[PDB]
Amino acid sequence: LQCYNCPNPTADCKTAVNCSSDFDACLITKAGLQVYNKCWKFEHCNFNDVTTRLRENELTYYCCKKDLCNFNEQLEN
Amino acid sequence: LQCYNCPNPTADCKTAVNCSSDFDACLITKAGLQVYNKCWKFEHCNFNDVTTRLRENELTYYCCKKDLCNFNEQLEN
Amino acid sequence: LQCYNCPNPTADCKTAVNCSSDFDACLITKAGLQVYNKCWKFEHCNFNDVTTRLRENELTYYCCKKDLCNFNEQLEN
Amino acid sequence: NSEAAKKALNDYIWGLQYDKLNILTHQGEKLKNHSSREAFHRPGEYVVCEKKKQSISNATSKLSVSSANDDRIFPGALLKADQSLLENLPTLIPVNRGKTTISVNLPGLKNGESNLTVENPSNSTVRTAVNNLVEKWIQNYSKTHAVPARMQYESISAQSMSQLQAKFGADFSKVGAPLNVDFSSVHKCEKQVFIANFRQVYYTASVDSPNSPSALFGSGITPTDLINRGVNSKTPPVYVSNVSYGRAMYVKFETTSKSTKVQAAIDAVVKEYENILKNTKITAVVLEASKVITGNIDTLKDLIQKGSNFSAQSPAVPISYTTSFVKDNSIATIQNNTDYIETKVTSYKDGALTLNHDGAFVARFYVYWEELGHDADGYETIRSRSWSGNGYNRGAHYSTTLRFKGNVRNIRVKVLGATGLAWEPWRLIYSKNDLPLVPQRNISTWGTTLHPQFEDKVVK
Amino acid sequence: NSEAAKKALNDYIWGLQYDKLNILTHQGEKLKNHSSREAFHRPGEYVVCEKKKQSISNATSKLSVSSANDDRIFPGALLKADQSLLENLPTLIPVNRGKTTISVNLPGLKNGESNLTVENPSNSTVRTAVNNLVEKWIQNYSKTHAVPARMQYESISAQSMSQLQAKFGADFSKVGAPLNVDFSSVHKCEKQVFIANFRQVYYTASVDSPNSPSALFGSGITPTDLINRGVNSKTPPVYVSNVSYGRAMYVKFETTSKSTKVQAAIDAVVKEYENILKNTKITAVVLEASKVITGNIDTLKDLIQKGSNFSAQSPAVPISYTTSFVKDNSIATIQNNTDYIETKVTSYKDGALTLNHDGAFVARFYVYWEELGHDADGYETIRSRSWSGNGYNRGAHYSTTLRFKGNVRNIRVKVLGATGLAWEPWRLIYSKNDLPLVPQRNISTWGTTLHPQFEDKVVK
Amino acid sequence: NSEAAKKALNDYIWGLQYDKLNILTHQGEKLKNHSSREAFHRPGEYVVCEKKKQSISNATSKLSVSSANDDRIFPGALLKADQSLLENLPTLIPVNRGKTTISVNLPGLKNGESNLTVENPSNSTVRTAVNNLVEKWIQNYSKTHAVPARMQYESISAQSMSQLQAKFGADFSKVGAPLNVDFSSVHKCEKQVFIANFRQVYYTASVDSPNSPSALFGSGITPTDLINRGVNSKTPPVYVSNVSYGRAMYVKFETTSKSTKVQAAIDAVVKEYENILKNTKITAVVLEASKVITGNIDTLKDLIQKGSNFSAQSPAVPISYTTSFVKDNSIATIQNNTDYIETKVTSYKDGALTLNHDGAFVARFYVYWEELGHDADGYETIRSRSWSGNGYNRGAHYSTTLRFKGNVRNIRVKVLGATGLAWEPWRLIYSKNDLPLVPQRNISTWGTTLHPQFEDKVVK
């Protein structure tokens, strides 16, 4: 229900609030050092989807159905 | 019946709970050294299924169906 | 109908018990060092079910319908 | 008169009443609550019997047609419900019998040559009527006559006789007496009896619905007459409705080998069974009888080869019977029961089992067995046994023979490649457990050290 | 007469009221849901049993007819709606019947040949009438008529025989009785028996519904006549509305193997596996005429192929019928049920697995196995099984044997071509999981340590 | 007489009115809308079924007819609006009909001349009239004329007998019994079952809608008899208007290989695929047949080529009908609606990825994947998957097969041909996104640093 949403990419992902139906799941991504977790539409969850809504090219991401259950450290290293 | 439902894979084995159909099976996984005893779905119990829901490739495992009988020493190295 | 009905993986039979349900016979099994005697269902008496319920590939057994006739030394060596 | 006869017979027969199945329920043998599995050893032989309760309560409304009951074929022969009737004894009665339409059905029959009527039903009268009808149809069409292939082939384990009193009927008690179904030996768990009944209808007969019981009587019957005539309330009248006529072949395969393959064998020649038949001395009986009593390969396919055509050569018999209640024209039926023991029996083989260790690589032979037995109490058991030189070395060439008795079960054989390394020094060429009993087996190993092969060989 | 008789019979039966599907319903066997999964190991075989409840409740209006019921069935005949009708125990009535036109469905007749009329309907009269109507067309046009009617190709497993009485009809209880259908075996998981009905309806006959109740009686039914003829409210009067005809057969296949490839055998005979054929043990009741009697691959094929069409001689017998509540002339219908713990039985072959390493490199194997079993309490379990020889080196050539037993499931393999290079000298050639059960798999590696090739052969 | 009867009857039936389309509406399975997605893993296959409520709401007046109701099928009778009428078990009636005409679609006329009539219909009368006209036209001109030669070949996933009840009518419930449809295996994602219904029209018969109510009954119909007949608003009269004529074929393609390719499989036979057809479990019913009874690769081809080209070899059988409320005299339509689950029949499989590197330059592959996974409840999720050979050096040649499983999704590849120049020592030869799974994908590189050229082979 209440999902993580930072409009500003952050490694320390803290700002998590109750959001609407637009997103479907909690999506965290990491590019180099930058980390961005956010309420994300799981259909609009796609490697290409993330890379286009982030204007960046190379990354490693993960989106999980249940909100707030998504964080960077689950990705390798 | 009562399955052992560990919260997160660890050498600790004390939390035994009377579980729902998620006690379709009692699950215990020794991956490397980390051990996890959870409520589980038996038809959903297999090498593949448990390796997915545990996210790692290599694994040693045992499933029981009867109450709590799936145990740590039940696994042998 | 007094078999040896006492689960013990040891060299001594503890208590001679009149079992009915799983005393269709009484069964003793020596696997290397360990030995186990208990009431047993005679149709379920066979090499393969024993080695499964034991997981040990080298074993010997003796199952007999007669009461307590499955005593330890009735198994040889 | 005949109207008053009809009225009185309908009235009394309505006052007549009975649970028709009660008077027509039968029981054969009965056995107390015994069941047991027991083994037995013999010089070069082994057997296991499962003597288990056999109980059947089967019934029908097809009734047999045999000599002691042949007296009332050409249906319509009204009877009086009795246990004589239950066990196939009909009641003749010098009654004035009234006109009724009787009709026999045939393949291809003429437009109007299935309808008949008889004023005074009597075996002579109705017999001549149906004789002349079937003679018309036998001269008219039997050149191109073909059968509706009603092959009612039947096979049963003839382990019990009361089972053959319930299933096939009470009267068989006599008709099997020449067939010699030695069920008693089966109970003694020594000999095996399998019965095969080929049957076939060539035609059958029919009677109009009796609007009255005296619609059968000639005219003017009074109830107290039928009373004096023997048909009474305690033995109520039963209105026969059909007799079936055709071909039969009533074979009993008699053989000791308790492998149930016999019931394949008995029919595999109607299609190993060869040798199990080789010493059977089969006995047969037909209800060209002597052409069967000698027995040959194609007797049954002859019972259609000739049994497609009808001729004047050799007798084909009326094959079945039936009858219905008179009081309400309700269908009548038997209820025969049997209770006895069935013994499902088997056998297992002692023979020379040769272990031929001839491979240039000295393997070590772990061999293990299960052994089902008893001692001193008769209480069942089964135990583990293992090879003499179990996992113990054997010479470079070693052909050993074992009096491999068929009493043991569930063999396991691990042949062992010998290695000198530390990590798992016990090297496997062939460890298969739970392997089949080979009476005479040349169990040899073979191959090279870099490729060790097993040989699951039979000597022969 | 028949007018006052009509109004009397109508004032009588129109008030009589009950549900057919209540008096006519055969809910034979009831069974609690017992869910028993179980297993069994035999020499080189794994077996699972699934005793799971399966109720089978059916309803139908096509009331079957076979040999032992032939003579009493034909249209327009009144009956008393009772369990009599249910198990095909058809009861008659003494009531005189009245003027009725009788209709048939015959392909090709010309404008006058399909209708008749009988004043006093009688088995003889109407039977010879319809036989006449047949004899018209049998010789006239049979040269170029091929009635393409239903080739009902029905198949089912011969499970608890009450489920057969439900899915197929009550009266089968007798006609399939000689089919050598093992009740307990399937009921108790011994053997596999599949029954397959084959048909072709030839034609049928039909009654015009009574515009007059006494158009069913011979001009003058009285309610006291009807009741003296045994008709009451409990077993009400119904009138047959159909009799059907044609070629029929109930062919069986009786073999040890489960896994309904049995049905593959049935069809590809109607249309190794060679040995599941070799294990036929067929037993069939049928209804050239000698290839009828032998029974084999070509026999049924031809009989449904060249014999299915109207025979060179004659069709067989009435196949079915139906009736209708005289009150409202409402159509009748059976309701036959049976509940049984269906055991959809499945086998698992003893797998074998040879491990061959002919590659130049030294490969290291880990073979992960699944294991389905129980734990000492009848409770299920599933477990891992580790390749005990893991982390081991294998020669330039290599071949070992492994009982990849029927107890094994969901295998996974990692093969490791060892490389003399420094950057992770562990080079993965082949990891693959979730493979099927192979009776004889050969995992043979190949190639060089620079390019490790592989072969996954099935020698068989 | 019949005029006062007609005036009373018109008032009667006009008062007997109710909603035809709701007295005839069959609303079937009531389902909650839920989409339950869930995946399963066959040994090497990744199936994903999302069961979903799929509401099949349907209505029609194309009321099909089968064998079990040929006894009542023709236009002209008078039926009663009831669940009986609903479930295609027609109701009888003691109605003696009146003068009415009947029309017959004879191919070869140039006006409405081939018409007939009956003053008092009876199934025999109207039946022989219609069959007269049929044989009349068959013997005259159909030898030398054309016929509609078109393909009406319906198909559907037999997801439910309620789904099939809404799709193809209610009474298919009984007629689909021998079809061998395991719609429950579809309910549990075990196998997939599609029916292909090729109906077959040759002709149809019609009848003049009621122009006079008492032209539908013998002269002098009184509504008092009709309520004595049960003809009243409770079950008001209905007027059959048409009956079809032809054949049918319900091909049941049932495969264990769960896919949509099933229909292509059918279309591979209608006009590799060897495999999809190899698990056909074809089970055809028929509503001569020998042409299908033999079985071949073009049996449908000729069944439309010759069977749909229906000739004078043998006329067809009645196939369907329709009716009309007697007052309405207008089309009568059942509304057979159902909801039902809709398994997402989708399926996916592993596929090798042969990373082959042959180029003369130092190449390095990075392959990224999307990754279908589950978390902590079985909850669905997608994941990044990074190449293990990423950051991993590869020689002049590097060919390893990645077990690129269909369980993996959205693959993307980058291949690096590294250069010797200090500034940007990297050169891209190949990089691709939006590429699908490949069974065997030899992704090869060739050439040298100055010209790195690609190869994308699917050896398959």
Author numbering:
A (entry chain D), B (entry chain B), C (entry chain F): 1 to 77
D (entry chain E), E (entry chain A), F (entry chain C): 56 to 326, 335 to 350, 356 to 528
Copy text from the publication:
Other CDCs, such as intermedilysin (ILY) secreted by Streptococcus intermedius, achieve species-specificity for their hosts by hijacking the cell surface receptor CD59 to initiate membrane binding. CDCs bind target membranes through interactions located in their domain 4 (D4). A long extended domain 2 (D2) flexibly links D4 to the membrane attack complex perforin (MACPF)/CDC domain (comprised of D1 and D3 together), which is responsible for pore formation.
Here we report a structure of an early prepore-trapped conformation of the CDC ILY solved by cryo electron microscopy (cryoEM). In our structure, residues within the β-5 strand form a new helix that comprises part of a helix-turn-helix motif. As a result, the β-4 strand is exposed to propagate oligomerization by binding the β-1 strand of a neighboring monomer.
